[PDB]
Amino acid sequence: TRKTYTLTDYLKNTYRLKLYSLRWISDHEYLYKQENNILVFNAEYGNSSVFLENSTFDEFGHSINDYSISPDGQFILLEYNYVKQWRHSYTASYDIYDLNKRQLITEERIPNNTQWVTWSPVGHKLAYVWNNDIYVKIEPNLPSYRITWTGKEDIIYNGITDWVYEEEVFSAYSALWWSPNGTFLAYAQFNDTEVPLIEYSFYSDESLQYPKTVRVPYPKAGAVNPTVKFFVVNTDSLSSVTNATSIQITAPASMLIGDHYLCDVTWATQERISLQWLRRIQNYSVMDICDYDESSGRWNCLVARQHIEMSTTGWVGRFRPSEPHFTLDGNSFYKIISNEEGYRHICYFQIDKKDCTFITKGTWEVIGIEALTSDYLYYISNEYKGMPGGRNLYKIQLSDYTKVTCLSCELNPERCQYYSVSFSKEAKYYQLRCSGPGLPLYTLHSSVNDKGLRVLEDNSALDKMLQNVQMPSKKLDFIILNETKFWYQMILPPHFDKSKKYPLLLDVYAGPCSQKADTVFRLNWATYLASTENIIVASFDGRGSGYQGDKIMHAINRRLGTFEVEDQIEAARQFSKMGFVDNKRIAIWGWSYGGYVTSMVLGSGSGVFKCGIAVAPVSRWEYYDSVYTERYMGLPTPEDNLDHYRNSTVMSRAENFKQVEYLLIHGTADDNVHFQQSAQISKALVDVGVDFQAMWYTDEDHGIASSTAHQHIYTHMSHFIKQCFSLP
Amino acid sequence: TRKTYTLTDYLKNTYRLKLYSLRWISDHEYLYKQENNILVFNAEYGNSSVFLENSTFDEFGHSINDYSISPDGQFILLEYNYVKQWRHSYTASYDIYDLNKRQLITEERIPNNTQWVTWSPVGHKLAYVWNNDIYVKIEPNLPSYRITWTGKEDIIYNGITDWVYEEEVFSAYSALWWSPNGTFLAYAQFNDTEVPLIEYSFYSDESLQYPKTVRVPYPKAGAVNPTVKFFVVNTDSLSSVTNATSIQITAPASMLIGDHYLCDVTWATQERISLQWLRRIQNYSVMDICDYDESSGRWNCLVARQHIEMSTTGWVGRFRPSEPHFTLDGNSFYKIISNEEGYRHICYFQIDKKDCTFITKGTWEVIGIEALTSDYLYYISNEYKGMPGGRNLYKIQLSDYTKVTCLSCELNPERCQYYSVSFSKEAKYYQLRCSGPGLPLYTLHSSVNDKGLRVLEDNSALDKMLQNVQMPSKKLDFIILNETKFWYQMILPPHFDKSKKYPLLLDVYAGPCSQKADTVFRLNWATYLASTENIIVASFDGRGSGYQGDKIMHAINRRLGTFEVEDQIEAARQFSKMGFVDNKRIAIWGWSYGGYVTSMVLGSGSGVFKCGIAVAPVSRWEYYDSVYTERYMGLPTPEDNLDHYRNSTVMSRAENFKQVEYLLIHGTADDNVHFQQSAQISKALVDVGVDFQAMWYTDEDHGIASSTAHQHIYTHMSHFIKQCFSLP
């Protein structure tokens, strides 16, 4: 009798997915790490050489966290002393190694505690941020040029984002953008002077006698937001003038009338940059397209080139307005936008014409534009088989939009329904990454004839291992509610018997534009629960969920904590109707937005769920950050949406928790969903005399991701679910 | 069949103990609040009159928290807008009502947010502290004289204590001391300039968008302490034109050489004050006796009148050097000190002689000196029947120390073995308060022939109610360890059957000088556990416990977390061998110091305990306050006691928790034992992969005493214990 997939299997990673992470360094070569060597591969033929021997930095004296080769291949940037900050931010030390001289550079070193560093896109210039100011090095061994003097910790951020811009706008710490050949350096400056601070304790190692108070500028909903300015400096002038001028590009008048955000920066040509701005009320966005004026040294944005993007039903974009993809001449661009039927499709714009032309259409959506050549646009969508949870690569002929080829659909239709892609520098080659429903499969292809060159990684090692394991299966299907298809997945125990009644765990996220029903292969907690504990683990994408049109996505506009919550309850009712679910043993759990929905469900009075677990939940929208929250909720003012902000809190449902078993879990150093949010849930439950289970994680953040804390939380939750389901 | 004492009975106070809280106002009369009316009683005859009608303040407009009648009976101070601070500190608003003219004083009112107020001991002067400064009013309707001008929040404290002096030295917020007839006002001034601050979050009501950070000057072990100065002001020579002159009395040279504390202030006569100072290494204390010089207006403390009190085996005093009790002329005094056998007895001192004479002796201790006349000294001791956990009132004939009379031992030997006492102004009368083993009993007596005048309150109402309840019993007894007796108590289930096996919960405190085995009648959580759940609740007084001599008490000197922890394990081991204890079901619990011991016991690897609960535990001594911790531990420096500080932590025992069920509980707003302490425990257990149960209480402090949190904690703990013991 084959073993099952156990909790220790999951926690110890005994069954490991192999990846194939390559780095394109040109149109036909990529870098690959094998046995701590860096190998260079020829894409066409598959032959390789040692780029950098594993032993090169044995006497470096530091463990190297990561590396970055300069575009011209002359230098390598070595990252060490890595210290994580938020989701994307960190600080580190850096050395530069001269590849031709086979020597480490010892003069004019990048300082310690550097916040961000990037090569220019061509050559070997560097820009870096240190103590919140921008510096540029033209040559790796030569003195830096200081670009800004206003940097001030927690106050003025030059070339890097503050907390909210990092998390909600740019999904990145970096706020600088080199022009295509590296002449210009564009950057944003954030001013957080009047932004309130979140403060929480950090306990550190037990040696620390007094806890530290962490203080972060963080605008909660309706609070004072950071302000932003945008600048461009000519780096080619740096060695000729004592103090090169950063030229400001100001937001349009339609943005300056009130609070606003900078939400996109994309260079079009060597002398043309596009910027998108978003009103604090996030249903109106403006793109400016700005040209360098050689005679004046200024940047001018013609109103004839300004593009408006607005929504009447919701916010703009999935999580932000989409990025433009410019044709080589910079005179036109492609952008994903919601069409008249509410489906996101590719629109083609001339820079000085306001009406665009849709080049794709249908009741499905484009997920991303991946590459653009003179003859073809390459994009990912969920068109194939009308499955919103599948992903395939397509190629559209620019001279003939009727000519659309699916590049991945039929490669291995049984094994592979969810692709992402990695193109070489001028799209001569592409790596396809299949992530399910079978084992991930990595392959290489030539763009010239769309032929498969070779399999890079097929996970045959893991396949072999898993043959000895009673693995669960996955069902992906839909139910019809109010004449609309809503998709669900079930992780089903091995030897699933439809004539039996199984306990069911509803695994919930359900945030706006979320997707929890898909074709991705996962080895996770659900695998164990199904394989070992014979629990069905289900997920459902109801109103508010993504990739299915605006009618579904915008259904929760200004009304978080309503339809997406009800639809999870209704999903559980529907799963009972299916006949293989023990109605006495239905649980629900979720993390983050999923913790909020879980708590709302457990507090609803539905009687459907026996028990549930919320991990790091939102409990009240006024506690969460402005950019994310206001996107869906508008402002917490009597004139806008305060009534709904107050009506959608977990705390107001406290009395209903008498009907359920609840486990509430939060990390004490969560900078994102503050521990405050669960502190207020627990206090409300205490106040109405409701017993529940609790667990804090000392010094853990929103990920609760440290090795020991990760193992501890899943161990704790497993005991809780098993007790609830009367499982020995 | 009759009901049991249930968890709801404990939580809703179904069975209430009656008290008789009186306030002596003279040698012959006392005040007693009855039906919200203040009555005055004649002690000799027990007749009364209405002193102040309940309805006098019907239109007052505020809920009155408390009252204080001036010593001359002419005024009543009305306390309202009460806002708690720490254990003893609070602020309030005050009004004064003139009892003769039947009117509120509206002129020159005491300000809002007053920190401390006190009548002079004679007449009706007032001293109050507001915004950290001292003010005096000679008449309730006249303007105040500002005494000090240096008061500064969290920095300079005039006439009030800082956090550590409040909690650890004076057990009071007040640092003001009127002379016996009100001529002089003595006060201390604390300076916390370089004391580090503990910082923690306070979440407040749900409406508060950003948590507040509370910051309290709090010296952890080894940290910079507050400094202190002492002053005396003449309140009879205050002027409206000139600022008051305060006369400083400086500490002796033997204190000024390093860190020290002011630990006692006791007026001897109208012109003589005593102070005791304590070294930061709390085994050396010095009393100065200081006399007013009418010609210089200075206070001189003759060196011939200095009294040194030191310890070679531990610290000085039970929790601080004891208070002196001066004779009428103030030329001599009585003080409890540890004799050559290490038992605390009354010593008689002449103000200018070095040697004192012990007037009591034996293998038992004096608990307190209660009254002094020219003929008798009245004291409480545990001499009777050699029971260290019993308390009785004695008088000793000052002309013949062989003549000692027990005044309470034989009044009701079965019901009453634990007394406290309240004497009238010149000891003409005394109220005895019996608190166990039977129901509390309040009686009034006259000193001249020790007549038992009358019964004030016999709790006969409660007795009648309890007849219909299956109440537990209490066994008080001893075990021998190493030729020494150590006392324990057991709360035994109703109808206790010594041929049955009961589960046993060990209820622990075990701090230095603690006593958990006594003759006191209590209605508490243990009553419920025994009465309803049939659990034996045991407590044991081992090494380090009080009231049994320094051999026992000082056994843990410089070594907290050693013998007192081992002795609890040994007691349980012994209990576990008794015929009526189920050795498979032994649990341990404690709060505060008891939570530390519980945690150290559970991390000991003993195997004796199935489960335990730690509430607000200390986890590492370097996290607790200086005055308490260093008293027992010295300084956490390599040259002193750092090594023992480092190996007496809960965290180092984390691995040993693998074979026990542990519930760890802590209030997030604990200003005393910081949440930090439990935060470091949880992290240690996570780090070794030990599962446990946790509960935080949002915004609760060391008491976890709000009505809702108190009910919630005891409900949660009851579930945990019942689960542990397999109880339905």
Ligand SMILES: *[C@@H]1O[C@H](CO)[C@@H](O[C@@H]2O[C@H](CO)[C@@H](O)[C@H](O)[C@H]2NC(C)=O)[C@H](O)[C@H]1NC(C)=O
């Ligand atoms: C992969 O092999 C190719 C072709 O064999 C290498 O490219 C050149 O090969 C020819 C002879 O076949 C010679 O001119 C040189 O030896 C090679 N020049 C280069 C580019 O170094 C190529 O080197 C191989 N690629 C890798 C990354 O190992």
Ligand SMILES: *[C@@H]1O[C@H](CO)[C@@H](O[C@@H]2O[C@H](CO)[C@@H](O)[C@H](O)[C@H]2NC(C)=O)[C@H](O)[C@H]1NC(C)=O
């Ligand atoms: C960041 O924004 C703040 C405003 O919040 C600017 O601070 C003000 O500067 C002016 C001078 O121009 C002063 O008169 C005000 O007193 C300041 N106000 C506040 C609230 O501090 C600040 O100059 C901005 N910094 C940068 C570099 O843009």
Ligand SMILES: *[C@@H]1O[C@H](CO)[C@@H](O[C@@H]2O[C@H](CO)[C@@H](O)[C@H](O)[C@H]2NC(C)=O)[C@H](O)[C@H]1NC(C)=O
């Ligand atoms: C380089 O030029 C910038 C921009 O003119 C200078 O920044 C100004 O510095 C002065 C005085 O130090 C301030 O009053 C201005 O508010 C600053 N403006 C900006 C945009 O930051 C900078 O000081 C110059 N650096 C050098 C070396 O001269």
Ligand SMILES: *[C@@H]1O[C@H](CO)[C@@H](O[C@@H]2O[C@H](CO)[C@@H](O)[C@H](O)[C@H]2NC(C)=O)[C@H](O)[C@H]1NC(C)=O
């Ligand atoms: C990168 O692009 C920039 C901007 O177009 C080039 O700089 C210009 O070069 C032209 C010559 O063709 C001159 O007319 C201008 O004076 C330059 N403009 C600026 C703003 O400096 C630059 O030469 C390009 N770099 C490379 C390596 O090709």
Ligand SMILES: *[C@@H]1O[C@H](CO)[C@@H](O[C@@H]2O[C@H](CO)[C@@H](O)[C@H](O)[C@H]2NC(C)=O)[C@H](O)[C@H]1NC(C)=O
């Ligand atoms: C204590 O506080 C109250 C309220 O602030 C004071 O009451 C006065 O009367 C009303 C509200 O009851 C306010 O408008 C006034 O500002 C208050 N003060 C004045 C000027 O009379 C009260 O005075 C305060 N008590 C003292 C002694 O300061």
Ligand SMILES: *[C@@H]1O[C@H](CO)[C@@H](O[C@@H]2O[C@H](CO)[C@@H](O)[C@H](O)[C@H]2NC(C)=O)[C@H](O)[C@H]1NC(C)=O
């Ligand atoms: C309380 O005691 C003080 C101090 O002994 C008394 O003040 C003294 O009174 C006598 C007059 O009888 C004067 O000769 C002294 O000069 C006073 N001394 C000081 C220090 O002021 C005071 O009279 C007593 N008051 C009461 C209420 O009995």
Ligand SMILES: *[C@@H]1O[C@H](CO)[C@@H](O[C@@H]2O[C@H](CO)[C@@H](O)[C@H](O)[C@H]2NC(C)=O)[C@H](O)[C@H]1NC(C)=O
């Ligand atoms: C008060 O206690 C201290 C600490 O126990 C005693 O001072 C010395 O402490 C150091 C280590 O901290 C040791 O090296 C010495 O052995 C201690 N002194 C002795 C006993 O010689 C100090 O002696 C105590 N004071 C009194 C009055 O007994």
Ligand SMILES: *[C@@H]1O[C@H](CO)[C@@H](O[C@H]2O[C@H](CO)[C@@H](O)[C@H](O)[C@H]2NC(C)=O)[C@H](O)[C@H]1NC(C)=O
């Ligand atoms: C208790 O009883 C005595 C009488 O036995 C009360 O009477 C004394 O005081 C009264 C007013 O203060 C006078 O009216 C009496 O004349 C006086 N009697 C004597 C001679 O002592 C006394 O007040 C009573 N006490 C109380 C508090 O009511």
Ligand SMILES: *[C@@H]1O[C@H](CO)[C@@H](O[C@H]2O[C@H](CO)[C@@H](O)[C@H](O)[C@H]2NC(C)=O)[C@H](O)[C@H]1NC(C)=O
């Ligand atoms: C309270 O104590 C502080 C010392 O902690 C006193 O300040 C002194 O120490 C300062 C450094 O903090 C020195 O700069 C000064 O010499 C000294 N005094 C001054 C001017 O601050 C402080 O005076 C004390 N306050 C009172 C009222 O006694």
Ligand SMILES: N[C@H]1Cn2c(nc3cnccc32)C[C@@H]1c1cc(F)c(F)cc1F
């Ligand atoms: N802060 C948000 C940022 N975010 C999220 N999805 C994204 C997709 N793309 C960009 C930013 C994105 C959820 C994420 C997020 C949402 C929450 F509601 C929450 F409680 C905690 C979170 F981390």
Ligand SMILES: N[C@H]1Cn2c(nc3cnccc32)C[C@@H]1c1cc(F)c(F)cc1F
């Ligand atoms: N801070 C201490 C003050 N204290 C204690 N007993 C006393 C007796 N007399 C004066 C102060 C006294 C225990 C008390 C105390 C001791 C502790 F170890 C603890 F963790 C928490 C506490 F509150």
Ligand SMILES: *[C@@H]1O[C@H](CO)[C@@H](O)[C@H](O)[C@H]1NC(C)=O
């Ligand atoms: C980084 O820090 C270390 C330790 O302080 C130091 O030796 C080294 O010189 C630093 N590097 C730079 C570039 O300053």
Ligand SMILES: *[C@@H]1O[C@H](CO)[C@@H](O)[C@H](O)[C@H]1NC(C)=O
């Ligand atoms: C943006 O949203 C607000 C609130 O729903 C609305 O009043 C306004 O008309 C919207 N603007 C656009 C461009 O639709």
Ligand SMILES: *[C@@H]1O[C@H](CO)[C@@H](O)[C@H](O)[C@H]1NC(C)=O
């Ligand atoms: C009293 O002292 C304070 C503080 O030093 C001062 O401001 C005030 O003017 C003084 N008053 C008189 C009457 O001297």
Ligand SMILES: *[C@H]1O[C@H](CO)[C@@H](O)[C@H](O)[C@H]1NC(C)=O
């Ligand atoms: C260098 O990498 C590893 C040591 O980290 C070693 O196993 C490997 O054999 C080396 N590379 C080569 C030349 O294969």
Ligand code: NA
């Ligand atoms: Na009597």
